[PDB]
From a paper:
Here we break this deadlock by developing tRNA display, which enables direct, rapid and scalable selection for orthogonal synthetases that selectively acylate their cognate orthogonal tRNAs with ncMs in Escherichia coli, independent of whether the ncMs are ribosomal substrates. Moreover, we build on our advance to enable the site-specific co-translational incorporation of selected β-amino acids and α,α-disubstituted amino acids into a recombinant protein produced in E. coli; we produce milligrams of ncM-containing protein per litre of culture, and solve the structure of a β-amino acid-containing protein.
For ncMs 12 (6-((tert-butoxycarbonyl)amino)hexanoic acid (BocAhx)) and 13 ((S)-3-amino-3-(3-bromophenyl)propanoic acid (β3-mBrF)), we identified enriched and selective sequences, and found that the most selective hits converged on a distinct sequence pattern for each of these ncM. Notably, two PylRS variants, PylRS(13_1) and PylRS(13_2), identified by tRNA display selection, directed 13-dependent acylation of tRNACUAPyl, as judged by fluoro-tREX. To investigate the incorporation of the β-amino acids, α,α-disubstituted amino acids and β-hydroxy acids into proteins we added the orthogonal synthetase–orthogonal tRNA pairs for 13–20, the cognate ncMs, and GFP(150TAG)His6 to cells. To further characterize the incorporation of 13 at position 150 of GFP, we solved the structure of GFP(150(S)β3mBrF)–His6 at 1.5 Å resolution by X-ray crystallography (the protein was purified from cells harbouring PylRS(13_1) and tRNACUAPyl). The electron density shows consecutive carbon atoms (C2 and C3) in the protein backbone at position 150; the meta-bromophenyl substituent is attached to C3 of the β-amino acid, and the stereochemistry at C3 corresponds to the expected (S) stereoisomer. Our structure confirms the site-specific incorporation of the expected (S)β3mBrF-monomer in the protein. The introduction of (S)β3mBrF leads to a notable kink in the beta strand of GFP, when compared to the wild-type protein. Notably, the hydrogen bonding networks of the residues immediately preceding and following the β-amino acid in the polypeptide chain remain essentially unperturbed; this indicates that this beta strand can accommodate the β3-amino acid at this position.
Numbering used by the authors: 4 to 64, 134 to 298
Write the structure that this text describes.
């Protein structure tokens, strides 16, 4: 499905969440440019005040927009599953705190790439870095390690997110990921590699709702030319 990503593609993101019994919704819109590995989106909390820090939701809120270099084209599972798309499931374990469990469908709905997510959070501390809102409003560059899951005709990924904390410490979030195609058409099953990620978080001066503006660049790496 790599032909679907040669230009700029519109994106819609819909998240329904529950964290320690607090119900919230997020809606996002923007565009993806896989040629340059670039994502530009704005998210709104449509239920009022977001009950967790915006940075904790960034990984949950479309790896089909990653830039795969030409020599790594045969390792791009994410585009190969389009347009019917894939199911992306995670467990995110916040060190010394709670756990998110997520299930999303990523697929084309007409000409728009849509990411529809359900999130359940449990076992969070009221006084912790997440429900205490003690995380900095920023985002680090990460190491996303991908391996084939031959049995399920899909992939797994494993990686650590580093959330800077206002007291100068780091809140680790361990990510465990599975992706399975929605269609029965063939997909690419990759050799081991990683996605090199970078993001910045900002605000829109004319937006009164609780929101996050996101710019992200992602490139695949870890396989030698030849």
């Amino acid at each position: 499905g790599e032909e679907l990503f040669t230009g700029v593609v519109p994106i819609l993101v819909e998240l329904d969440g529950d964290v320690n019994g607090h119900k919230f919704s997020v809606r996002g819109e923007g565009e993806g440019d896989a040629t340059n590995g670039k994502l530009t989106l704005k998210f709104i909390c449509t239920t009022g005040k977001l009950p967790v820090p915006w940075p904790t939701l960034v990984t949950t809120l479309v790896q089909c927009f990653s830039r795969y270099p030409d020599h790594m084209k045969r390792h791009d599972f994410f585009k190969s599953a389009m347009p019917e798309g894939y199911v992306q499931e995670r467990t995110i374990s916040f060190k010394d705190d709670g756990t998110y469990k997520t299930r999303a469908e990523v697929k084309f709905e007409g000409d728009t790439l849509v990411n529809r997510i359900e999130l359940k959070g449990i076992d969070f501390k009221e006084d912790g870095n997440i429900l205490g809102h003690k995380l900095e409003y920023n985002f680090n560059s990460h190491x996303v390690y991908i391996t084939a899951d031959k049995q399920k005709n899909g992939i797994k990924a494993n990686f650590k997110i580093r959330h800077n904390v206002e007291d100068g410490s780091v809140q680790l979030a361990d990510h465990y990921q599975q992706n399975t195609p929605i269609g029965d058409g063939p997909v690419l099953l990759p050799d081991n590699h990683y996605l090199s990620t970078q993001s910045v978080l900002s605000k829109d001066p004319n937006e009164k709702r609780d929101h996050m503006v996101l710019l992200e660049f992602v490139t695949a790496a870890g396989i030698t030319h030849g």
